[PDB]
Amino acid sequence: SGFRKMAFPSGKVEGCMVQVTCGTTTLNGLWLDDVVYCPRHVICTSEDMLNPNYEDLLIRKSNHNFLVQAGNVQLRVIGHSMQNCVLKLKVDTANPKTPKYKFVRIQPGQTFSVLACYNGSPSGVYQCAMRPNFTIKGSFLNGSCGSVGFNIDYDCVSFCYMHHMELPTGVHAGTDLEGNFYGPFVDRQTAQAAGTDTTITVNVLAWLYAAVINGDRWFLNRFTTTLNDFNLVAMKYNYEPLTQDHVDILGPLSAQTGIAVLDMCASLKELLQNGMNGRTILGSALLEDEFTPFDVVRQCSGVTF
Amino acid sequence: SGFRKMAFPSGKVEGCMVQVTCGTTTLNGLWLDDVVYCPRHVICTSEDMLNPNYEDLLIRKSNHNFLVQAGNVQLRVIGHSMQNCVLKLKVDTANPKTPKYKFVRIQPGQTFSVLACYNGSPSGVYQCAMRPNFTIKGSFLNGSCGSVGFNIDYDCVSFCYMHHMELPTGVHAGTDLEGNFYGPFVDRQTAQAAGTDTTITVNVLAWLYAAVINGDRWFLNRFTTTLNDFNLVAMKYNYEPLTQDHVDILGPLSAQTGIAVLDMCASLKELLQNGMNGRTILGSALLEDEFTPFDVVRQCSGVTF
Numbered sequence A, B: 001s002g003f004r005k006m007a008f009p010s011g012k013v014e015g016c017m018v019q020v021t022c023g024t025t026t027l028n029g030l031w032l033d034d035v036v037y038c039p040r041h042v043i044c045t046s047e048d049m050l051n052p053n054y055e056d057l058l059i060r061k062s063n064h065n066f067l068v069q070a071g072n073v074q075l076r077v078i079g080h081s082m083q084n085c086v087l088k089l090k091v092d093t094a095n096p097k098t099p100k101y102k103f104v105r106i107q108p109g110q111t112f113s114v115l116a117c118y119n120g121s122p123s124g125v126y127q128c129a130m131r132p133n134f135t136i137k138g139s140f141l142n143g144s145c146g147s148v149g150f151n152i153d154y155d156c157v158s159f160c161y162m163h164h165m166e167l168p169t170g171v172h173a174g175t176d177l178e179g180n181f182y183g184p185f186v187d188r189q190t191a192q193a194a195g196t197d198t199t200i201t202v203n204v205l206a207w208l209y210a211a212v213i214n215g216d217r218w219f220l221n222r223f224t225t226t227l228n229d230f231n232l233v234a235m236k237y238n239y240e241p242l243t244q245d246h247v248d249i250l251g252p253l254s255a256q257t258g259i260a261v262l263d264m265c266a267s268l269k270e271l272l273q274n275g276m277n278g279r280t281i282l283g284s285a286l287l288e289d290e291f292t293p294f295d296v297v298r299q300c301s302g303v304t305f
């Protein structure tokens, strides 16, 4: 029993991380097959980042200006192209550690693991969620650009995130592996504002189910509610609206615990209105929203990879 | 910026996990060089676990009764011995993925990463602390026995924990890699009570320093205190006593922030006495104690492996 903020094992991704240097900028790249993916702002200087014209900056770059180092061995760059906000560096050697993989663009509220890297070397792994305003609350320092987020299904790595930048508010923004930013952000050092950070309601409910499965039941209440009545409470508390698709996805947790989804919504509602009175749930003093329903069933049943 | 419950990259340990079967019991083992380490209760049946005589049970076992499977390939067992509460299985093949490693017995309050495994396959990785009562608050289901805890320093894996059992309270107990339990627990299905779970004071202070570094400063107060005055408050709140060794270890964080350790203790004291008034610190609504001072400096400076 017990419940933990658990990340995927990172070994399959560790074997794909490399260091990419261009001029005086060094960041991380992802080496899959014979292509290395990295943020296109690797071609920029700090003076460049206020209003970069990436197409113009890329004219002054040739294949040999991109230094790619995998471990302590040097990769030969045989072609380069810009796809949206990522650079693709064609190297002459396929990565021998390439796992089965897919590139996926995730939806807000979905979770993934981040392997934080500096100079192409892994520093740590942690679990994140794509916030409803399309930021992530990560842990990144200078040089972390190009670190990636991923999910694993048995043997297939789904890459969903590449880190590009920190907003002035200390939250983080990045792209999918096709180079398209999540949310409205652009890769330039301009003040950019994130949007309201709302709570991922379907995830909170999944975590409440996880609490019940693990024996933490004090918050279970005598009430039920309706989807419209709950959502009217949800908007007051900056919670995302709950839809019937969300109810459907919670079905297996409802079945395991015998607690109807709408009954759990009524328990959540009383927690939003009354607070937690200094009590805790699964060791947290607030309502946790970075476990998906699939995360909960995975962790509570022991799916392996 | 930002601050996350971050685990070490697990790839080096993933390559050492194997499945060990004896009779009808299957659990995880750790394959390093030509030895496989697993919990000795692999030789037990469920009827055995009320009062097992391991020396007697081991008489009825031969090398060929231990089935060791690494990936989907079978290892040949050429010798076995019991060391405290772990079995050591000598195999004829050295693990080619063996990293540099050490076996370390950690102190309460120290943290480590856990790679949770089932049937020798990794399921997830998370960060834990050895509680002052010598339990860990993990996430483990049946079949997780033999999962290991570890720390990494550049290229050396320090293994500190092997999972053996869940207490009736849902917390977890296990051994170092020499087979000696942390705390007073024994590998039998008897009711065993854990001891008071106190808060790791030096870790809370480190995390308060991490909050300051990351801009979360509302709790900084106008007061200072003394080590004896603080500890008198500490014992009322079931916090571990703070010693001058702890003050010494916080020195670098004190130097980075300009906040004397005793000033931070005075801020902590007011937080214990007044609570947090519905405010949060680094996204937590309670005081976090599973970051060590070394964890904080590591994460806030980007040490890699």
Ligand SMILES: O=C1N[C@]2(CCc3cc(Cl)ccc32)C(=O)N1Cc1ccon1
Pocket: A041, A049, A140, A141, A142, A143, A144, A145, A164, A165, A166, A167, A172, A186, A187, A188, A189, B001
């Ligand atoms: O290394 C850098 N350089 C930064 C500074 C501001 C900036 C603006 C742009 Cl457009 C692109 C990259 C950067 C940045 O955000 N990081 C990564 C980082 C630091 C903290 O969290 N993530």
Ligand SMILES: O=C1N[C@]2(CCc3cc(Cl)ccc32)C(=O)N1Cc1ccon1
Pocket: A001, B041, B049, B140, B141, B142, B143, B144, B145, B164, B165, B166, B167, B172, B186, B187, B188, B189
């Ligand atoms: O797979 C098993 N079998 C258990 C059941 C009770 C027990 C008693 C002893 Cl002496 C040794 C092993 C076991 C156990 O604790 N686990 C691992 C587990 C389950 C949940 O968290 N960890």
